[PDB]
Amino acid sequence: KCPLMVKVLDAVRGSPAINVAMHVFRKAADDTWEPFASGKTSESGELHGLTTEEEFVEGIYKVEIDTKSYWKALGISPFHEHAEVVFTANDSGPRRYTIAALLSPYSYSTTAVVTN
Amino acid sequence: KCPLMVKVLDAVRGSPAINVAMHVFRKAADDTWEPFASGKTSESGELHGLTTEEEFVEGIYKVEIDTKSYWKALGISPFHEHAEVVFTANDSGPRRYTIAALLSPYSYSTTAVVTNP
Amino acid sequence: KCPLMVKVLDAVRGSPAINVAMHVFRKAADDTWEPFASGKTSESGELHGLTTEEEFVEGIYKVEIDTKSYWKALGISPFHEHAEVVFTANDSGPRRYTIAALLSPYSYSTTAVVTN
Amino acid sequence: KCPLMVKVLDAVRGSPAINVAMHVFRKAADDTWEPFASGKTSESGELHGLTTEEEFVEGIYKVEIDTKSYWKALGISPFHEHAEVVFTANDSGPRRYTIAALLSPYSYSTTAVVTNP
Ligand SMILES: O=C(O[C@@H]1Cc2c(O)cc(O)cc2O[C@@H]1c1cc(O)c(O)c(O)c1)c1cc(O)c(O)c(O)c1
């Protein structure tokens, strides 16, 4: 019953991206970003436990993934400072979100799988 | 001659993404995002002439593509509010940057092609 | 202990792609493709049980995914006849392979996560 | 004037993919793949002049990009043998096709942009 999960893959090595830091924010009434949650990806390239179904209310959310530090650790100079995923959550009721990020040094793709 | 251009494709239609609004910011000394340029893509899904070789100094830049408005205009309710590409530019000297975005309602990818003038 | 798994996602709807047919082949001595396994994706957009670690020997493999029939079922005329993933398997010993395909009507991406 | 072109980008380097070999086939009446055209990408990662508006009749075509040789030449051992794009062309009348491929060692994406002459 985890409603927000993030999965990061490394397209160069073909493996999960481990130890990728990410920060999750929610848009405040004053249109600024308020810190919500944070963590680092597991050995499976995943991050769970960001929030509970109860705390995860309708809102605009941002997931910032520190892709630059990941590549620098591997000795590669990347293009992006980080990867941002910005989205409206739960506007039609509660959903479970899996955000996937696929990383290359000069390119990334992000996809959402949203289920009921 | 143009140091920063953006190309946007539509993965649903198999076509350039037309009339996609974009905003560019540059990070100021104070750590805030200062507006830097804007525009919309043409019939070829491209936006050129955002800045000049002389004005586009070293800095951290953000290109914000209003993908949500793009999809809504087509009657589609997509996942993302927008697509944002944040990068340091010109730190090892001047380069030409092409930012390419490929859009689907629930997914997008972005790639940079960076070449030495 | 499943060594070859395929996961298909729909980038338009943001959901697993369910009931996508796929066929798996291995390159024969006579450089032709020999049928190996087949199936359709589950409600989770996944296909397992294609092979066992014992039967999955070093070889060149092809996974053909019938993306065209999937889109036609949804009333969309797609570009590709199907998506092909062609790769050498197990050349350095046994690995577990997860092949992911992300589908849009005029674009697809494929990624491999290979673990030990 | 050119009805079929291919653009290949390198997602590791942030650059066009140069000297990528490609082979195109067309499905024959007998269900076999008959060789149709070939070439390599230029310095701009593009391959043009594969066929002519007149020769590129309705059919099922396959573009096979030798991504494995590309990566090996760079010292990298990638996952795929090649990238293959199989599609029906010109079934609703003549169109112009651009096949775009974005390459990483363990991932690639391919997109078609199809426009009406
Ligand atoms: O400490 C804030 O962020 C932390 C530092 C930081 C940064 O330096 C640059 C950046 O790209 C992201 C970033 O995330 C950090 C962060 C820390 C957390 O503990 C956290 O829960 C989070 O969501 C994120 C913060 C505080 C704020 O009060 C605030 O309004 C805000 O927008 C942000």
Ligand SMILES: O=C(O[C@@H]1Cc2c(O)cc(O)cc2O[C@@H]1c1cc(O)c(O)c(O)c1)c1cc(O)c(O)c(O)c1
């Ligand atoms: O009508 C457009 O597509 C069709 C309607 C549609 C939709 O309502 C919601 C959605 O999730 C997907 C979607 O795909 C439809 C579609 C139908 C086709 O026959 C087709 O070949 C195709 O590429 C696609 C269209 C036009 C456009 O001009 C456009 O840019 C675009 O992205 C899409």
Ligand SMILES: O=C(O[C@@H]1Cc2c(O)cc(O)cc2O[C@@H]1c1cc(O)c(O)c(O)c1)c1cc(O)c(O)c(O)c1
């Ligand atoms: O956003 C600012 O203006 C516009 C409104 C707007 C918005 O409502 C939401 C959003 O996602 C983006 C956004 O971009 C707009 C914008 C317009 C421009 O003409 C422009 O050059 C630009 O950089 C951007 C802005 C930002 C700022 O950070 C700022 O300090 C300021 O004075 C102004």
Ligand SMILES: O=C(O[C@@H]1Cc2c(O)cc(O)cc2O[C@@H]1c1cc(O)c(O)c(O)c1)c1cc(O)c(O)c(O)c1
């Ligand atoms: O029956 C063969 O394939 C089946 C029909 C078929 C097709 O018509 C077009 C196409 O794109 C793919 C395709 O896969 C089918 C198939 C069926 C299976 O049961 C299977 O295990 C498999 O791998 C795949 C076959 C037999 C052969 O003897 C053979 O050499 C071969 O290459 C293929």
Ligand SMILES: O=C(O[C@@H]1Cc2c(O)cc(O)cc2O[C@@H]1c1cc(O)c(O)c(O)c1)c1cc(O)c(O)c(O)c1
């Ligand atoms: O040396 C090239 O990259 C570096 C070496 C390398 C490798 O040995 C294996 C691998 O898995 C990835 C890889 O990334 C390296 C890399 C280093 C950088 O500093 C960098 O900015 C970058 O984009 C990347 C190179 C040159 C190229 O000309 C090229 O086309 C290419 O794709 C790559």
Ligand SMILES: O=C(O[C@@H]1Cc2c(O)cc(O)cc2O[C@@H]1c1cc(O)c(O)c(O)c1)c1cc(O)c(O)c(O)c1
């Ligand atoms: O592959 C044929 O020639 C070349 C060798 C070759 C290969 O070893 C492996 C592979 O992945 C692709 C491949 O393409 C080659 C090829 C060369 C060309 O000049 C060409 O126009 C073409 O379509 C293709 C071929 C295929 C056939 O199906 C065929 O009937 C034939 O007579 C010949």
